[PDB]
From Swiss-Prot:
Key enzyme in folate metabolism. Catalyzes an essential reaction for de novo glycine and purine synthesis, and for DNA precursor synthesis. GO terms for biological process: dihydrofolate metabolic process; folic acid metabolic process; one-carbon metabolic process; tetrahydrofolate biosynthetic process. Pathway: Cofactor biosynthesis; tetrahydrofolate biosynthesis; 5,6,7,8-tetrahydrofolate from 7,8-dihydrofolate: step 1/1. Inhibited by isoniazid metabolites. The prodrug isoniazid is metabolized to isoniazid-NADP adducts that inhibit the enzyme at subnanomolar concentration. InterPro entries: DHFR, DHFR-like_dom_sf, DHFR_CS, DHFR_dom. Substrate binds at I12, W13, A14, D34, R39, R67, Y107, T120. Pfam families: DHFR_1. Its EC number is 1.5.1.3. This is Dihydrofolate reductase.
Amino acid sequence: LVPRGSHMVGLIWAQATSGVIGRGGDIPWRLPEDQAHFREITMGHTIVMGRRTWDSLPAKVRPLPGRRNVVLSRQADFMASGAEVVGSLEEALTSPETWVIGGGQVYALALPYATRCEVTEVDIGLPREAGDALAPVLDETWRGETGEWRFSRSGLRYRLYSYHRS
Ligand SMILES: NC(=O)c1ccc[n+]([C@@H]2O[C@H](COP(=O)([O-])OP(=O)(O)OC[C@H]3O[C@@H](n4cnc5c(N)ncnc54)[C@H](OP(=O)(O)O)[C@@H]3O)[C@@H](O)[C@H]2O)c1
Ligand SMILES: CCc1nc(N)nc(N)c1OCC1(COc2ccccc2CCC(=O)O)COC1
């Protein structure tokens, strides 16, 4: 349970088995089961994303519905129509429950404050290339639950992990 006076911070991402989460300003696969899972977890909560992740959303879809959208930028003239832009995680993490939804820079930034991670791993063989955005690496303070491999309607295997720490 999440007491309303707390500030719970979770990270949620989908990665290939290599750790790649983004390339060329997009996610280099599509998995409908992961889209549904991402929405089930985040709906109703504040979502925090990096400026480059906001840029990756088509103008017609953003801000993402059903969730308070917060965008991190250091640029005083960057504006996100329909959403709030803030310059730090301290300013972004005011809600009782916040999901950090990417990308690679913002996961690394938020990791020291996070107590939950929800991961989808997609069994697509995408090697890491220079410039890719990557999932954060989780140290031994994190305890994980790994689901069995499942199979998507799209013909890719995937599995879910849930990590927690104190
Ligand atoms: N697979 C997934 O689950 C998933 C999820 C989300 C995104 N993605 C992908 O990941 C890629 C984007 O990731 P990315 O690592 O390139 O970028 P990102 O983390 O989404 O955004 C980086 C931007 O955040 C801002 N920022 C970073 N550190 C900050 C700090 N300390 N204070 C304030 N603002 C800060 C900066 O904005 P300014 O430059 O404006 O200062 C920086 O350029 C895309 O390919 C996207 O499609 C994948
Ligand atoms: C789903 C990808 C994803 N999966 C996990 N597990 N974690 C993430 N953080 C993540 O990326 C979430 C973003 C990309 O969402 C997309 C992308 C394509 C299609 C549909 C959506 C959801 C739209 C919505 O939610 O209405 C929203 O900005 C990045």
